[PDB]
C-alpha cells in the first residue's frame, strides 16, 4: 500500500520529515525512497498537506532559477492552481499555502510517491 | 485506492475524521454503518498520527470503561495501556496533546477506523 509510517491520501503516499535539510538534500532523500519532494497537483492534496504538516515550514518539489519559470521536479513548467508567494527559488508550504525561499535554508520536507 | 474517498491511510488502516459531533454511542453507530469502529488507538505511533491530523476539536475514540474497571476497546479486549488517559470519565477522546475522558452522552467529533 504505502511504506511503513507514510501517510496515504487518494492515490499517493506521503512522508513528512522530523528533521530539516536544504531543498536539494531534501529531494536527494526523497529520490532515495523512489519518491520526489511533493508534487502538489490539486487543492485537495494541498489541503491534506496543510492539515497534517503542523506549524513548521515544509519543502515541496517546485523550483526555479532567477528569470525562469517554476518547474516540477521533472523539469516541466508549473501552471498555477494555488499561488506561490514571494521571490525565492524554492517552494515550501507554510500555514496559509505555498511560499518561496532561498534554496540553502533548512526546512522540513514532504516526499510523495504513487501508491502503485 | 487503499481507502475510500475522505479516509486517510496509515499502517494498513483507513481513518475517518468527522465534521459534525455526536455522543459516543451514536459515533460508534456511525462507524459501524461504514464497516468500521471508533478508532482503537493501539500504539503510540497511531496516537501521534491521529493528533496530527484531527485538528483543534476533541474527537472520541474507541475506548470506554465501567465504574473503576479497566479500559476496553469496542471489540471487548482490555486496552494495552500504551499512553496516559486523563480524567475520570467513562469514554475516551483525544484533545490537542493526548487522550482524556468524559461523560459518554457529551457531543464531540469522532474518528473511525477499519482495515484497508
Ligand atoms: C512531470 O511532473 C508533473 C508533476 O507531477 C506532471 O504533471 C507531468 O505530467 C510530468 N511530465 C512528464 C513528461 O513526466
Ligand atoms: C545542501 O546541504 C548539503 C548538506 O546536506 C550540503 O552538502 C550542501 O552544501 C548544501 N547546498 C547548499 C546550496 O547550501
Ligand atoms: C481488539 O482490538 C484491538 C485494538 O485494535 C486489537 O489489537 C485486538 O486484536 C482485538 N481483539 C480481538 C479479540 O479481536
Ligand atoms: C446519543 O445521541 C442519540 C441521537 O444522536 C440519542 O438518540 C441518544 O439519546 C443519545 N444517547 C445518550 C446516552 O444521550
Author numbering:
A (entry chain B): 74 to 189
B (entry chain A): 73 to 188
Study text:
Signaling by the human C-type lectin-like receptor, natural killer (NK) cell inhibitory receptor NKR-P1, has a critical role in many immune-related diseases and cancer. Human NKR-P1 and LLT1 are type II transmembrane glycoproteins with similar protein topology: an N-terminal cytoplasmic signaling tail, a transmembrane helix, a flexible stalk region, and a C-terminal C-type lectin-like domain (CTLD). In addition, NKR-P1 promotes transendothelial migration to immunologically privileged niches upon interaction with its endogenous ligand, lectin-like transcript 1 (LLT1). Here we report the crystal structures of the NKR-P1 and NKR-P1:LLT1 complexes, which provides evidence that NKR-P1 forms homodimers in an unexpected arrangement to enable LLT1 binding in two modes, bridging two LLT1 molecules.
The crystal structure of the NKR-P1:LLT1 complex is formed by deglycosylated NKR-P1 and LLT1 ectodomains. The asymmetric unit of the crystal contains a complex of dimeric NKR-P1 with dimeric LLT1 and an extra dimer of NKR-P1. These NKR-P1 dimers have the same helix α1-centered dimerization interface as the structures of the unbound NKR-P1 dimers described above. The LLT1 homodimer engages its partner bivalently, i.e., one dimer interacts with two NKR-P1 dimers related by crystallographic symmetry: each LLT1 monomer binds to a different subunit of a distinct NKR-P1 homodimer. NKR-P1 and LLT1 establish two types of contact in this structure – the primary (LLT1 chain B:NKR-P1 chain D) and the secondary (LLT1 chain A:NKR-P1 symmetry-related chain C) interaction modes. The primary interaction mode is established through nine direct and several water-mediated hydrogen bonds, in addition to two charge-supported and π-π stacking (Tyr201-Arg175) interactions, with a total contact surface area of ca. 800 Å2. The second interaction mode is established through five direct hydrogen bonds, two charge-supported and a hydrophobic (LLT1:Pro156 – NKR-P1:Ala149, Leu151) interaction, with a total contact surface area of ca. 550 Å2. Besides interaction with LLT1, NKR-P1 dimers bound in primary and secondary modes also have non-negligible mutual accessory contact (NKR-P1 chain D and NKR-P1 chain C in symmetry-related position, Csym). Interestingly, in the present structure of this complex, we indeed observe the formation of a chain of repeating NKR-P1 and LLT1 homodimers. This pseudo-linear multimer has a zigzag shape in which the membrane-proximal parts of the two proteins are on opposite sides, and it is structurally based on the alternating helix α1/α2-centered NKR-P1/LLT1 homodimers (the chain-forming effect) and the simultaneous involvement of both primary and secondary interaction modes (steric effect).
